[PDB]
């Protein structure tokens, strides 16, 4: 795996 958490992993 996970680079961006939450909104950033979209």
């Amino acid at each position: 795996g996970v680079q961006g958490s939450g909104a950033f992993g979209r």
Partner: antibody
Amino acid sequence: QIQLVQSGPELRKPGETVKISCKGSGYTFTHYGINWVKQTPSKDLKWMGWINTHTGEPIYADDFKGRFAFSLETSANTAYLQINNLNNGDMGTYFCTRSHRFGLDYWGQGTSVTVSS
Amino acid sequence: DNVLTQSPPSLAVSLGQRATISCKASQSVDYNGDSYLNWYQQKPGQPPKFLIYAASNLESGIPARFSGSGSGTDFNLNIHPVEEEDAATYYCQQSNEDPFTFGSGTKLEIKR
């Protein structure tokens, strides 16, 4: 046995610079983002932004745009936070955290920063 | 920003009883079927501890005495039975938008 371990407490005079490390172990470091979180003296939690550990690209929260820099030394499995031109408002504890799909799962232990002459 | 308001600021609960902590968001955190809202537990001297994600999903390794509910703007953390180890500050956090925001926390005190 996964952990994030940060560097120790730091004291600086106003106007100086601090660089703080966060070393990840027990997993592939370049596969997970690192977020930075400030805890103020009054204990408020503020998200500062994050760094993509594969591309090296940082994103800063609007509150942390200017004097704050996220960097990497991936051969050390380490992310850094640098704070330039320190003022009294930068006092607090700084945490690195690993990105999770929804949350922030693994946390470093905190690095306190004291600003004093 | 999406401002998270928690209540009460603190509370005292007798051992074995239920603690209920509320988190209210100024913007909906719903995206594609999921609520992007997480709960942490913090003890002084320690980092926050990841308890619950996506409103109601317990992080692996966390006791099932902790449970979360809600969607949209209105969320609750429930702790039952309250235990000695549960004295801490509890924070909600949204990840639906930049910047991520935390509530200012609810301190749980234990009565014995």
